[PDB]
Design a protein around this ligand. Structure first.
Ligand SMILES: O=C(O)c1cccnc1
Ligand SMILES: O=C(O)c1cccnc1
Ligand SMILES: O=C(O)c1cccnc1
Ligand SMILES: O=C(O)c1cccnc1
Lengths: 191, 191
């Protein structure tokens, strides 16, 4: 069993200068104790939009389709409120038949701009997948931008390599972070 | 058995004016005879780059990773030449374990800017999938842009709805057309 080292390595998508400003946040929110047979990754996406514009989208646990690809539908409770412990039933059209992903809201901090979720059921999902997303505001000479960090820990399926597990999960997260950046940059350019 | 109607409907991503200029091309290259249990779709993507810049990328049958997502690797023959009938073995990391997709080059027309392929083997692939991609140059008041059309026909898996089959395939094609547009627009902005 070891502690992940995401705070010691510049993630793809981030400059070293930005990283040095985020060291304590990555230590606090994007560190995991991982066992053999588990892997973990940290991904970053720069967004030319204000933090609260990005956070308003990121934080909608009931509307993953607004920032993620391959979401056919998402159902929550009749009296769903945005509280830790809530679940969502996502139908993912990344293959046929569409898969069910039952996901738990693990963290929601509107002050610190932190959220995260765990896959707790469904079919054809990653085993023991948990992720955390944080949103960070940057300024330089009056210019403003945002950095989104997203990390996960996941079990490596027996019969699969850690290399492929990481390649799959990284590709999904990165593509969704790119959708997040497009959606929020459009809102920023337009509103 | 019917003939598809893609030439009578403006596809998503295309203006009616552009469509009226492409009617004969869609009839020629993007029409299929479909049987019950089959479905077909036409997708469009506008690209702010010259046709030959787009075609140079689109036409590389041996390098799908340059315009498509979730491609872990692509292997061709030792003396692979870009000829109809050639095959490629693509490793697709859209899930675990990665899938093998064996694909046949069906069409390659460098004059008309037409290509297409068929899935002829592998695992966890669509059954009877065939697609055709065409690239078209547009001009207006000196300004130049490109339109890429991509259509497919595919079998609807027994147990799946045509709605979900079309949603899956459309999402993949559209996302890859978006990567094509980013890659070629970057080349255009830079070269
Ligand atoms: O199987 C594929 O080709 C595929 C599945 C999901 C996402 N992208 C590609
Ligand atoms: O965030 C997701 O939904 C996700 C991320 C990685 C892999 N599979 C799903
Ligand atoms: O299973 C998923 O969440 C998934 C798989 C491929 C592509 N996008 C998402
Ligand atoms: O072009 C592809 O590789 C493709 C398109 C739709 C569905 N699956 C794969």
């Amino acid at each position: 069993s070891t502690i992940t080292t995401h705070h010691l390595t510049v993630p793809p998508g981030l400059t070293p200068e930005e990283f040095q400003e985020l060291s304590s946040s990555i230590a606090e929110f994007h560190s995991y104790r991982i066992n053999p047979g588990q892997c973990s990754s940290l991904l970053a996406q720069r967004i030319h939009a204000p933090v609260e514009t990005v956070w308003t989208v990121v934080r909608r646990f009931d509307k993953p389709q607004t920032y993620k690809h391959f979401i056919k539908s998402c159902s929550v409770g009749e009296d769903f409120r945005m509280t830790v412990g809530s679940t969502r039933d996502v139908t993912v059209i990344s293959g046929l038949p569409a898969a069910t992903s039952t996901e738990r809201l693990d963290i929601l901090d509107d002050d610190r701009h932190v959220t995260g979720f765990s896959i707790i059921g469904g079919d054809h999902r990653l085993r023991n997948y948990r992720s955390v997303t944080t949103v960070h505001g940057f300024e330089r000479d009056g210019e403003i931008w945002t950095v989104v960090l997203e990390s996960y820990v996941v079990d490596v399926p027996e019969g699969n390599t850690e290399e492929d597990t990481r390649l799959f999960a990284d590709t999904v997260v990165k593509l969704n972070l790119q959708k997040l950046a497009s959606v929020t940059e459009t809102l920023a350019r337009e509103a």
